[PDB]
Structure formats: structure tokens, C-alpha cells
RNA sequence: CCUUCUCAAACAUGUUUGGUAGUGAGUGAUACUCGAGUUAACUUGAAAUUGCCUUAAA
């Protein structure tokens, strides 16, 4: 949610809704960065999961 | 505030601990009756774990042995059941980082089976015993001019002579000999001595100390295991290395 | 700071690698700067010996660690083993505070104090950080001094220890000193004498004194873990049956013989008699 | 034990009963043995371990050969120790069971039950597709919590304990011999806490009436010595029972170390 | 409208009467906490009811725990309408079995089973079953 | 926001014996022994509206 400039992700919820993809807005690009071994991350995605 | 996940986790872990104690108690009752058609195993096993770790499972010979027992923190989210708490209180191990000496016999073995996941059990060498007594030795002493006794370090051989002279214990060296050889008045000397208050292997919450805590928890998880099998062997570890780290 | 960052981010393996890839300071250049002369180092190691023998008898606490205590114990054992093997002790005095030793090291007299093996209480009123800084400096200095002394005597430093011997009794007997006539009368004292030390007698003190003034020691306390005996060192009010060929003496005979230099007669030291006063050699 | 002509006539009549002219056309052809006992087989304690009865004729091999024309084919599941799962493979069983045609379709361990099949729906979907489940006797005591309670409501999904270790080490030879012995000679039967025992003999299309008679006679002869049974019947789905045995005289049976350890560890 | 009664469902295994009371006492005083259990075995049916002294406290508990994810269970909390008291929710324990008395004598029970055998013979004769005895 | 009895002994790689008490709800037919104990098999997202010890510490 804390992405500056906000235009980078301001279209993402509408795109996810139109494509029928479940999305969630979360607090912390730093939290997503810890998820992906970076300082910050604007987005994260799960595509393939184990059984 | 208290969270429902913590409540449910504690309930489930306590239920599993109660079930384990129930099965151990049933097996020990049937073994004591010793006329039971149905049973899993009918003897005692000691699993020595040493150092990439090697494990040796042996039949308990039955000859009385000497053990050192250290009270460690138990399984996560487990409230200690009444029987285990009673055995720990009778052994004077109600708090962690505390150690005592134990005379291992066939009657002692089921108690260790009951209190397995809260203690670490080892065979103390003579050097470790001497280090423990001559480094951390305390007694409850009531002076002639003092109404209420207070705990002091075992500094006087005269106090030992006046408290255990009828049995024939003169000095701290005599106490060490009695504890090591498990002779007569072994219980008298053992309970004359207070339980030993060790110190934590890792203390502090800086970055280095938290890394040491993570390594210690990894090593303890690798070494000690919670069998929950009601016929599990008693785990015996390198108490010399443990006491070197804790003393 | 970087380790804190890795732990906060949850990179445990990265934190472990950071901890492995670190270098710590050493005090060897400071030692060589402050003591350009080995005689100066020998003249100054007395305070180092006192501090190390004090810290080797402390229990482990939150401020003082088992690693530091064990290192102090190791270096004290190495010093005691060197002194006992080279047979250099000259004066001994058992005061109520502890045992004072004076030994002739490299033509200089070194006096230090060894406390008894009892649980001394920590006052919680002292500056342990300052004392541990002094202890680190003293440990470095005495490591340098012990290395030089072992090399000049033609011995391997650091000496190895026997594991089962250390498991039996953890003293100076653990470290065996390997290579690659002494001065009479103190070094030659107690030669061809085997002392059966009783249990109540302080084994570390008696063994160090006898081995420095060479003799054989048989410890009664060593038989717990599991002939040539001329003397038996005992201290008890009433003693049981005695070997006819064995002379039964009290521990003060050893101290008085060492302080006199000449062999004091053993008649004046019996388990059921009064003892002569233990005078200070100084 | 059982009169030969009597049991042959009973088998012939019951196999005639099916061919008079969903699951209706398929379930009514399975033969069942009923054992009525004076007392409970197990006692006052529940049992999940299936008793094994040895017969002359193979049973699962006709099941495999007749499963070719069924919606749910015959399958075998093997459960081994987590520490011994790496010591075997599908080829390590194929090279030893290619002569006998015994195929082990799936080999798992306890880790798979704990992680992959933890969910109830996934666990049911995985378990329900197997017809013969075998497990190592070491891990077989933890299976009531791993496989769940639904897997013990049928004899085919209930695990069978087999001896896999010889000289206290994983012996592939002993494992293969026990697998072959279970597949060829022995059949399971669940001992209940009641007095009625149901034995699934198989399907009429699988085997001939002579083989059925031989197998049921051997089963009766083995189970007569096991307990003090009272009555024996043979039935099929949607059909009544036929008696085959009757005995009378068996009916007349109807009418502190813990504190010592505490004392030893206590001072007073 | 709304009462002070809360219906909870999709409970995990460890959630029982005492656990529910301990958790929701933080939200408010509880008049009665009950949990549906199986009659023959002491196992929960994973749903229960609670009663609050304050209906506003019950509404707060509902809007706080309505879709809480707990150990893979998405808990469901509803406010029961005005009235509709909770009733007939017994705390069953694990039932045990024991052999009862057998008052029929040996002769009578043997006669009863012989008559049952004769009845089976008559049934086989009736159903067109050609078998001996 | 925890994580599940991972086996023993007897005899000569083999034979015998002991060791295994489960998520819930529902459908169902069919027989057996005294409201009890047993009995073919089908469904389901982990499904659900009421059977009277404290250094895993701040």
C-alpha cells in the first residue's frame, strides 16, 4: 500500500478484478522485500504451490 | 490479552502430555503386576546419545548407578501434569537451571520415564562432581544465635563434621567420596547438600546472543527428542560437556 | 549492526555466514610494546598470576562466562605444570586467605597466591568489566611468557592434555610436557619418597609441592572414579590401623620441610600430637 | 470340521442365488462368512490389528486379474519407515516380484501422511483408491492417528503389519518374502468387540465353488482352534444365512512400585 | 432483532467449553457457554453457543471473530435473533460398556436359539431355498 | 498457530506371541448374540443453529 509513486500499482486491483485473480492489499513494501530478499517490493505473487 | 490460538495450542499439547503420562502409568502398573498376558516390552532401555550424532540403545543392567539430572525448559505450550509436577517437586527440581544427584534403580526408572521431557540425565564424572561441589556448594545452616536459617556456601568442614559426624562424614572430600561411591549415608549427604543452581549457557538478547540462542535451540532439537511412545528408552547425554558449558 | 539487520530480516544462514566471516582484535603488539624485555615481563607477571588464579576459581555467572573461566583454568594449569616439572618453587606459606608460593623464575623471584577450592561468594559490588579487561591483558601476557619459557626449556607449547586423566582429576597432572641435574636442596627434597595423600588433605596443593620438590603422589580421591609408599600424609583426629613400614605424617611437615630447605625430622609431626607453629618464610 | 457335501451344496445354492434371471448389480455377489461366538473375540479392549488366516489358494491374484473390468481397479499401498524409505525403489521391488506378477503401485512413509495427505479430503482420496494396504510393523502403531478413523471402517483400507527387519536392520529380502506371503497365502479378518465376525471371502466371479469350499473349510478349521466359537453361517449380500456348524459344550462358559520409587527419591 | 446469544461454528479440536469461556470472558461476562458433543463418544461437534450479559458485547464479539482464521479453520460467528434461548446441550463424557446381567437359564437360552434355528429352517422353506435341515 | 506409540522378546534369514481406542455430520440396507454389543458400503473444503517450567524476556 505504501508505493510512491502510487501510479505504479494504482491500476492493479482493477486489473486483478477484471482478470479474476485474487489479490490482497498489504502494509509494507519492506515486508514484501523481506519476503523476496530485497529492501522493498511493490508486489508479490504466488503462482505454483506444493501439494 | 490472551489469543485463541495460544489457548487451543496449550490445550492440545497438555492433552497429548496427559495421554503420554496415562500410557506410561498403565504400562508401569502392568509391569509391576508382572502377570499380564498383553504388553509391548517387559524391560528397560537406556539410549546413550553422543557425538553427526551416534545413538546406542542398551538394556538396563539393573545395577544401581549414579545420575546427574538437570531441569530444562519443557515442551512448548505444555502445562505440567500433576504427577510429573509431584515427582519434580519431590526431586527438588521445580525451577530450571537446577541440578541434583539421583541413585538410579529399577524403582527410579519409571519416575524418569514419567519426567523424561523436562530433564536432561547424564553420568557425572569425578572431575565434574568435584567441580560442582567445590564451585557451587550450598547448605541450609541454622546458627546457634539465629532463629531462622539462611543459605550459605559450603565453606566450613566443621559444619560438615557437626552435621554428619554420626554417620562418619568429616569433610567435603568425604561428602564427595560418599556421592561418588554411593555408599551408606548417600541420601543423607545428598539432601544435606542443596540443589545446584547452574547458569544459562546463553544469556542476553543482543544480536550475537540471539544467534547463539538460535544455534543452541537447533543443537538441542537435534539431540533431545520427544518420543511419546510409552516404552521409550531413557536418554543419556554428555553431562561432562553440558556441565562444562553450564559451570 | 549488520548481524542485527540480517536477524531482523530473518536471514539465519546469512547471519551465520556473517558471524563466521569476522576478525577479532589481538593484544600481542601491545604486549610487545609495553614489555620490550622478557625480564620486565617476568617482573610484572605476578599480578597476572594472582588475577588468573582468582578467576580460575570463580563460578560461572551472567557477567563471567564458562569459556573465560576455563581458559583461566587452562593457563593456570600450564603454569603450575611448568613450575612443577622444572622444579623451581622455593617458598610456601599457608595463610588463612590461601597458599602463597614463591618460585625462582629466570633469576627473579615470583610470589603469587592460590585460593582454596571453596565456593567464594560474588559481592556484586565490583567492576567486573574493568576486571575482565585486565584479565584479557594478563592472559595475553602470560600466554607470551609461557610460550617463551617452554621454548627456552625445550618443550612443546601448548602442551597436550590426557582426556581420561582430566576426567579423573583436572589439575596439573593432565598436561604431559614433552621435549623437542637440578639445584640442591629444595629440588632434591622428597626424592625417592612416595606419599599416599589422604582424602581430606588438599590434593592440588600437596601434589604441586611434592612434584616441584620431586616425589611420587598416590591420591586416595582418585580411586573413586576407577608397595613403594614410604609416607602417608593424613589429617584426622583418630586414625585406624597403620602399616609398619609406612611413616604417617601431617601436611604441615611438607610445608616446614620446603621452607627450611633441609629435611625437618618427621617425629614432630604426628596425627595425634600438637603441631609446631607454621612461621612465615618472609 | 464342516461336512464336505454340506458346504459344497451350500456354496452351489448360494452361487445359483445370484444368477436368477449402479452398485446394485455389483455388490450382491460378494460371499461372507459369519462367525457367532459365545464371548467377545478381543475382550473388553478394542482392537484394530487384523488377524491373518492362511489358506491354500491365492486370493488377491484373482482380485487383480478380475479388476481389469471394474471402475476401481485393484491397487497396493506400501508404508515404510521414514528412515528406510530411501533404501528401496519401484525397481527394487520389480526385480524381485516380476516372476510372481505382484506389483506395488505406491510406496510412501509417515512424512507423506503428515505433510502431503494431511487434509481430510486429500487423505480420503488417496486412501480410497487402494485395495491392499501393507505397512511396516514398527510404524503400524502410529497409523491410527496418521491415516485417520475412516480408513479403519473397512477391511481393505486397514493396514496389515508385516515383518520387514531381519537382525534389527532393513532387510529387503525379508520385506519381499513377507509381501509375497501376504499376497499369496494369507487373508485379513477384523476382530470386533462383539460376538459376530464377518469375513469377506471374495467374489463369485473370482473363483470356482471348489476353491471356495476348500478355502472356507480351511478357514473354519483354523478358526475352530482359535476361540470357543458357537455358530457358523455363510451368506451373500441381500440373501439370508445358511448354517454350517454347531457346538454345545463351549456355551457353558456363560455362567506399589511407583510409591517405592517416590520413597527412594525422597529423604524422609 | 438481536439477542445476547452467539453461535460459533468451525471450531478446532482444542476449542471446548472452558477454552471458549476463557477466551470470551475477555469480551464480557458469560451467562452460559455450551458446546455440542457426541452422545456416545466425548468428541465435539465443532459448534457451540455462548450467552453474554450485554448484547452489545455479543455484537462486538461477533464483529471481532466473524471470519477469524484459526488453525486452518475459518471460524463462523453469528448473533442469534431476539429471544431463541439455548437449550438441551449436555456435556457428554466418553461412554463405557459393561456386561449386564443374564437372567435366562442355560436351558431357556438353548431352547431360544434352537427355536431361532427352526425359524430359519421355516424361512428357507418359505423362500424356495433347497437346502438340507 | 502445539504436532502424532517409527516395536519387543522366545526358538531354530525363518515359525509363534504381545503391541494400534479414530474430525464431525448424514444416507442406508442385512443378518447375529444379550436400549446394549456386532454386521455388506456411499457422500463431504478441516463441511457444522441446540438428541438434557518464565532469558522463546522486553
DSSP code for A42: S
Say if residues C185 and C161 touch (Cβ distance below 8 Å).
Answer: no
Distance from C-alpha of D113 to C-alpha of D122, rounded to nearest angstrom: 10
Cis peptide before C158 (omega within 30 of 0): yes
User: Does A38 contact chain C (CB < 8 Å)?
Assistant: no
Distance from C-alpha of C32 to C-alpha of C34, rounded to nearest angstrom: 6
Distance from C-alpha of E77 to C-alpha of E59, rounded to nearest angstrom: 10
Distance from C-alpha of B29 to C-alpha of B23, rounded to nearest angstrom: 10
Please name the residue that has the C-alpha cell 455362567: D255
Query: CB count, 10 Å around CB of E83?
Result: 8
Chain B residues within 8 A of C61 when measuring between CB atoms: 199
Residues belonging to chain B = 247
Distance from C-alpha of A35 to C-alpha of C265, rounded to nearest angstrom: 83
Distance from C-alpha of C22 to C-alpha of A8, rounded to nearest angstrom: 41
Measure Cα distances from B52 to B55, B87, B222, B223, D210 in Å. Answer: 10, 34, 10, 10, 60
Distance from C-alpha of C247 to C-alpha of C253, rounded to nearest angstrom: 12
- Gap from B18 CA to F7 C1', in Å? 22
Q: Helix C252-260 and helix C203-212: axis angle, to 10°? A: 30
B/E touch flag: 3 or more CB pairs below 8 Å = yes
Distance from C-alpha of C117 to C-alpha of B185, rounded to nearest angstrom: 24
User: Does B79 contact chain E (CB < 8 Å)?
Assistant: no
The string of DSSP codes covering C185-216 is TTTTTTTT-EEEE-SSS-HHHHHHHHHHT--E
Long-range contacts of C35-40 (CB under 8 A, 24+ apart): C35/C141, C38/C106, C38/C145, C38/C148, C39/C106, C39/C108
- Whether B110 sits inside 8 A of D261 (CB atoms) is yes
Distance from C-alpha of E55 to C-alpha of C134, rounded to nearest angstrom: 69
- Gap from D141 CA to F7 C1', in Å? 9
> Residue E132: which of D6, D193, D251 has the nearest Cβ?
D6
Instruction: Please tell me the experimental approach by which this structure was elucidated.
Output: cryo-EM
Say if residues B234 and B47 touch (Cβ distance below 8 Å).
Answer: yes
Distance from C-alpha of C8 to C-alpha of D212, rounded to nearest angstrom: 71
**Residue among D118, D93, D260 nearest D180 (CA):** D93
Chain E residues within 8 A of B12 when measuring between CB atoms: 13-14
Backbone angles phi, psi at C104, to 5 degrees: -95, 105
Exposed / middle / buried, residue E71 (Cβ in 10 Å: 0-12, 13-18, 19+): middle
Residues belonging to chain A = 51
Query: CB count, 10 Å around CB of D17?
Result: 18
Residues belonging to chain C = 282
- Residue D200 CB partners (closer than 8 Å, separation 6+): D30, D31, D32, D155
State the nearest residue by CA to the C1' of F56. Answer: B76
The string of DSSP codes covering E68-106 is -EETTEE-EEEE--SS--------------------S-H
State the nearest residue by CA to the C1' of F14. Answer: D174
Question: What are D162's three cell numbers?
Answer: 508385516
Q: B233: phi > 0 → left, psi -120 to 50 → alpha, else beta; which?
A: beta
The string of DSSP codes covering chain D is ---HHHHHHHHHHHHHHH-----HHHHTTEEEEEEEESS-SS-SS---SPEEEE-SS-SHHHHHHHGGGSSS---EEEE--TTTGGG--HHHHHHHHTTTT----EEE-HHHHHHTT-SHHHHHHHHTT-SEEEEETTGGGTHHHHT-SGGGSSTTTS-EEE--EETTEE-HHHHHHHHHHHHHTEEEEPPPSSSEEEEEEEETTTS-HHHHHHHHHHHHHHHHHHS-EEEEEEEETTS--EEEEE--GGGGGG--HHHHHHHHHS--
Distance from C-alpha of E88 to C-alpha of A9, rounded to nearest angstrom: 54
Q: What is the dihedral of CA D2, D7, D10, D16, to 10 degrees?
A: 160
Give the distance from residue B53's alpha carbon to the nearest chain C alpha carbon, in angstroms: 20
Give the distance from residue B129's alpha carbon to the nearest chain C alpha carbon, in angstroms: 10
So where are chain B's domains?
1-247
**Interface of chain D toward chain E, CB-CB under 8 angstroms:** 6, 9-10, 13, 44, 193, 240-243, 248, 251-252, 254-255
Distance from C-alpha of C104 to C-alpha of C92, rounded to nearest angstrom: 12
Chain D residues within 8 A of B107 when measuring between CB atoms: 257, 260-261, 264
**Strand F: which nucleotides have any atom within 7 A of a protein Cβ?**
1-9, 13-16, 18-25, 29-34, 36-57
**Residue among C158, D263, C151 nearest B111 (CA):** D263
3-state secondary structure of C4: helix
Exposed / middle / buried, residue D232 (Cβ in 10 Å: 0-12, 13-18, 19+): buried
- Gap from D114 CA to F31 C1', in Å? 39
Identify the sign of the CA torsion D180, D183, D185, D188.
positive
* For testing contact with chain B, the best of C7, C10, C18, C161 (most B CBs within 10 A): C7
Say if residues D204 and D29 touch (Cβ distance below 8 Å).
Answer: yes
- Whether B111 sits inside 8 A of D257 (CB atoms) is no
Residues belonging to chain D = 268
- Gap from B60 CA to F9 C1', in Å? 15
Question: What are C183's three cell numbers?
Answer: 639445584
Say if residues C71 and B245 touch (Cβ distance below 8 Å).
Answer: no
3-state secondary structure of A14: helix
Question: What are D173's three cell numbers?
Answer: 529380502
Q: What is the dihedral of CA A11, A17, A23, A28, to 10 degrees?
A: 20
Resolution (A): 2.3
**Residue among C151, C134, C135 nearest C76 (CA):** C135
Give the distance from residue B2's alpha carbon to the nearest chain E alpha carbon, in angstroms: 7
Parallel, antiparallel, or unpaired: how do β-strands D169-170 and B234-237 relate?
Answer: unpaired
- H or E, element range at E125: helix E106-126
Chain C residues within 8 A of B130 when measuring between CB atoms: 169-170, 221
Distance from C-alpha of B71 to C-alpha of B112, rounded to nearest angstrom: 12
Distance from C-alpha of E44 to C-alpha of E47, rounded to nearest angstrom: 8
Say if residues B79 and B21 touch (Cβ distance below 8 Å).
Answer: no
Backbone angles phi, psi at B78, to 5 degrees: -110, 125
Measure Cα distances from B209 to B198, C2, C69 in Å. Answer: 18, 14, 19
The string of DSSP codes covering chain B is ---HHHHHHHHHHHHHHHHHHHHHHHHHHHHHH---S--S--S-EEEEEE---EEEEEE---S-EEEEEEE---STT-PPPHHHHHHHHHTT--SSSEEEEEEE-TTHHHHHHHTGGGEEEE---HHHHHHHHHHS-EEEE--TT-SS-EEEES--HHHHHHHHTTTT--SHHHHHHHHHHT-TTHHHHHHHSPPEE---SS---SHHHHHHHHHHHHHHHHH------SSPPEEEE-HHHHHHHH-
Distance from C-alpha of D141 to C-alpha of D139, rounded to nearest angstrom: 5
User: Does A37 contact chain C (CB < 8 Å)?
Assistant: yes
3-state secondary structure of C168: helix
Cis peptide before B175 (omega within 30 of 0): no
Distance from C-alpha of E85 to C-alpha of E80, rounded to nearest angstrom: 9
Query: CB count, 10 Å around CB of C232?
Result: 21
Residues belonging to chain E = 133
Say if residues C212 and C232 touch (Cβ distance below 8 Å).
Answer: no
- Gap from B7 CA to F24 C1', in Å? 21
Distance from C-alpha of B135 to C-alpha of C269, rounded to nearest angstrom: 32
Identify the sign of the CA torsion D24, D26, D28, D33.
negative
**Residue among B123, B98, B125 nearest B234 (CA):** B123
Distance from C-alpha of A30 to C-alpha of A36, rounded to nearest angstrom: 10
Please name the residue that has the C-alpha cell 462486538: E60
The string of DSSP codes covering E99-118 is -----S-HHHHHHHHHHHHH
Say if residues C62 and B203 touch (Cβ distance below 8 Å).
Answer: yes
**Residue among D183, D223, D211 nearest D100 (CA):** D183
Question: What are C185's three cell numbers?
Answer: 636442596
Say if residues E37 and E43 touch (Cβ distance below 8 Å).
Answer: yes
Distance from C-alpha of C47 to C-alpha of C54, rounded to nearest angstrom: 10
The string of DSSP codes covering E10-53 is S--TT--HHHHHHHHTTT--EEEEEEEE-SSSS-EEEEEEEEES
- Gap from B21 CA to F16 C1', in Å? 32
Breaks (C-N over 2.5 A) in chain B follow: 51
Cis peptide before E125 (omega within 30 of 0): no
The nucleotide minimizing the C1' distance to residue B15's CA is F2
Amino acid at each position: 500500500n505504501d508505493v510512491d509513486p502510487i501510479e505504479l500499482v494504482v491500476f492493479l486491483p482493477a486489473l486483478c478484478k477484471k482478470m479474476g485473480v485474487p489479490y490482497a492489499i498489504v502494509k509494507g513494501k519492506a515486508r514484501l522485500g523481506t519476503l523476496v530478499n530485497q529492501k522493498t517490493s511493490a508486489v508479490a505473487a504466488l503462482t505454483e504451490v506444493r501439494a | 490479552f490472551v489469543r485463541a490460538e495460544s489457548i487451543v495450542a496449550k490445550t492440545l499439547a497438555t492433552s497429548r502430555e496427559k495421554e503420554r503420562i496415562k500410557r506410561v502409568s498403565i504400562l508401569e502398573d502392568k509391569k509391576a503386576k508382572n502377570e499380564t498376558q498383553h504388553i509391548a516390552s517387559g524391560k528397560d532401555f537406556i539410549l546413550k546419545i553422543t557425538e553427526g550424532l551416534i545413538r546406542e540403545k542398551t538394556t538396563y543392567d539393573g545395577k544401581p548407578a549414579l545420575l546427574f539430572i538437570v531441569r530444562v525448559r519443557g515442551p512448548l505450550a505444555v502445562n505440567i501434569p500433576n504427577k510429573a509436577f509431584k515427582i519434580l517437586s519431590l526431586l527438588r527440581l521445580v525451577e530450571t537451571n537446577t541440578g541434583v544427584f539421583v541413585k538410579l534403580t529399577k524403582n527410579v526408572y519409571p519416575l524418569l520415564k514419567v519426567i523424561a521431557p523436562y530433564v536432561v540425565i547424564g553420568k557425572p564424572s569425578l572431575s565434574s562432581i568435584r567441580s560442582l561441589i567445590q564451585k557451587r556448594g550450598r547448605i541450609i545452616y541454622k546458627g546457634e544465635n539465629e532463629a531462622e536459617p539462611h543459605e550459605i556456601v559450603l565453606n566450613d568442614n566443621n559444619i560438615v563434621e557437626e552435621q554428619l559426624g554420626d554417620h562418619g562424614i568429616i569433610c567435603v572430600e568425604d561428602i564427595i567420596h560418599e556421592i561418588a561411591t554411593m555408599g551408606e549415608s548417600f541420601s543423607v549427604c545428598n539432601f544435606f547438600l542443596q540443589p545446584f543452581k547452574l547458569n544459562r549457557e546463553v544469556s542476553g538478547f543482543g544480536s550475537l546472543n540471539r544467534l547463539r540462542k538460535i544455534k543452541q535451540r537447533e543443537a538441542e532439537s537435534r539431540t533431545r527428542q520427544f518420543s511419546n511412545a510409552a516404552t521409550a528408552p531413557v536418554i543419556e547425554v554428555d553431562i561432562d560437556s553440558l556441565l562444562a558449558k553450564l559451570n | 549492526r549488520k548481524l542485527t539487520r540480517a536477524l531482523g530480516r530473518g536471514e539465519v544462514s546469512s547471519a551465520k555466514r556473517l558471524e563466521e566471516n569476522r576478525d577479532s582484535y589481538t593484544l600481542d603488539h601491545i604486549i610487545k610494546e609495553r614489555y620490550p624485555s622478557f625480564p620486565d615481563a617476568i617482573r610484572d607477571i605476578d599480578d597476572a598470576l594472582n588475577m588468573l588464579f582468582l578467576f580460575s576459581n570463580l563460578p560461572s555467572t551472567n557477567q563471567v562466562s564458562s569459556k573465560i573461566i576455563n581458559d583461566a583454568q587452562k593457563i593456570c594449569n600450564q603454569w603450575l605444570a611448568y613450575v612443577a616439572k622444572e622444579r623451581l618453587v622455593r617458598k610456601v606459606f599457608v595463610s588463612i586467605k590461601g597458599v602463597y608460593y614463591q618460585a625462582n623464575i629466570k633469576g627473579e623471584e615470583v610470589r603469587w597466591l592460590v585460593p582454596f577450592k571453596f565456593p567464594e561468594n560474588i559481592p556484586s559490588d565490583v567492576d567486573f568489566r574493568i576486571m575482565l579487561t585486565f584479565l584479557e591483558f594478563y592472559s595475553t601476557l602470560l600466554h607470551f611468557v609461557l610460550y617463551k619459557l617452554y621454548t627456552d626449556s625445550g618443550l612443546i607449547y601448548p602442551p597436550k592434555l590426557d582426556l581420561k586423566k582430566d576426567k579423573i582429576i583436572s589439575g596439573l597432572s593432565s598436561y604431559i610436557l614433552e621435549s623437542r641435574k637440578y639445584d640442591s636442596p629444595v629440588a632434591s627434597l622428597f626424592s625417592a619418597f612416595v606419599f599416599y595423600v589422604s582424602r581430606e588433605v588438599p590434593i592440588d596443593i600437596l601434589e604441586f609441592l611434592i612434584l616441584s620438590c620431586g616425589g611420587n603422589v598416590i591420591s586416595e580421591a582418585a580411586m573413586d572414579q576407577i608397595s613403594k609408599v614410604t609416607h602417608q600424609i593424613v589429617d584426622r583426629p583418630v586414625l585406624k590401623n597403620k602399616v609398619a613400614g609406612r611413616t604417617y605424617i601431617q601436611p604441615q611437615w611438607i610445608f616446614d620441610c620446603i621452607n627450611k630447605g633441609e629435611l625437618v625430622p618427621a617425629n614432630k609431626y604426628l596425627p595425634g600430637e600438637a603441631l609446631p607453629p607454621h612461621l612465615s618464610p618472609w | 470340521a464342516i461336512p464336505r457335501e454340506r458346504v459344497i451344496k451350500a456354496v452351489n445354492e448360494l452361487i445359483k442365488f445370484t444368477s436368477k434371471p449402479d452398485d446394485e448389480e455389483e455388490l450382491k455377489k460378494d460371499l461372507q462368512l459369519i462367525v457367532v461366538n459365545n464371548k467377545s473375540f478381543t475382550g473388553t479392549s478394542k482392537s484394530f490389528k487384523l488377524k491373518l488366516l492362511n489358506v491354500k489358494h491365492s486370493f488377491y491374484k484373482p482380485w487383480k486379474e478380475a479388476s481389469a473390468t471394474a471402475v476401481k481397479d485393484f491397487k497396493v499401498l506400501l508404508i515404510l519407515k521414514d528412515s528406510d524409505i530411501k533404501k528401496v525403489s519401484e525397481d527394487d521391488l520389480f526385480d524381485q516380484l516380476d516372476s510372481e506378477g505382484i506389483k506395488v503401485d505406491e510406496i510412501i512413509c509417515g512424512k507423506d501422511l503428515k505433510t502431503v495427505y494431511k487434509a481430510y479430503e486429500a487423505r480420503n482420496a488417496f486412501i480410497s483408491q487402494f485395495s491392499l494396504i501393507l505397512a511396516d510393523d514398527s510404524i503400524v502403531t502410529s497409523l491410527p492417528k496418521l491415516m485417520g478413523g475412516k480408513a479403519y471402517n473397512k477391511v481393505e483400507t486397514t493396514p496389515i503389519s508385516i515383518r520387514t527387519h531381519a537382525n534389527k536392520e532393513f532387510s529387503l529380502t525379508t520385506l519381499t518374502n513377507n509381501i509375497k506371503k501376504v499376497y499369496m497365502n494369507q487373508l485379513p479378518v477384523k476382530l470386533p468387540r462383539g460376538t459376530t465376525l464377518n469375513v469377506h471371502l471374495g467374489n463369485l466371479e473370482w473363483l470356482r465353488p471348489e476353491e471356495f469350499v476348500d478355502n472356507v473349510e480351511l478357514i473354519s478349521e483354523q478358526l475352530i482352534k482359535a476361540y470357543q466359537i458357537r455358530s457358523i453361517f455363510i451368506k451373500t449380500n441381500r440373501s439370508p444365512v445358511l448354517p454350517l456348524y454347531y457346538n454345545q459344550d463351549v456355551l457353558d462358559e456363560l455362567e506399589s512400585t511407583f510409591n517405592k520409587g517416590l520413597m527412594e527419591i525422597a529423604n524422609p | 432483532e438481536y439477542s445476547g446469544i452467539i453461535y460459533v461454528s468451525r471450531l478446532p479440536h482444542g476449542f471446548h467449553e472452558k477454552e471458549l469461556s476463557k477466551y470470551f470472558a475477555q469480551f464480557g461476562d458469560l451467562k452460559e457457554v455450551r458446546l455440542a458433543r457426541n452422545k456416545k463418544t466425548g468428541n465435539s461437534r465443532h459448534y457451540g453457543f455462548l450467552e453474554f450479559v450485554n448484547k452489545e458485547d455479543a455484537m462486538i464479539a461477533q464483529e471481532s471473530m466473524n471470519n477469524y482464521l484459526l488453525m486452518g479453520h475459518l471460524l463462523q460467528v453469528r448473533v442469534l435473533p431476539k429471544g431463541a434461548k439455548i437449550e438441551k446441550l449436555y456435556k457428554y463424557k466418553k461412554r463405557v460398556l459393561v456386561e449386564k446381567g443374564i437372567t435366562k437359564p442355560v436351558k431357556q437360552l438353548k431352547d431360544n436359539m434352537k427355536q431361532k434355528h427352526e425359524e430359519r429352517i421355516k424361512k428357507l422353506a418359505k423362500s424356495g431355498i433347497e437346502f438340507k435341515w
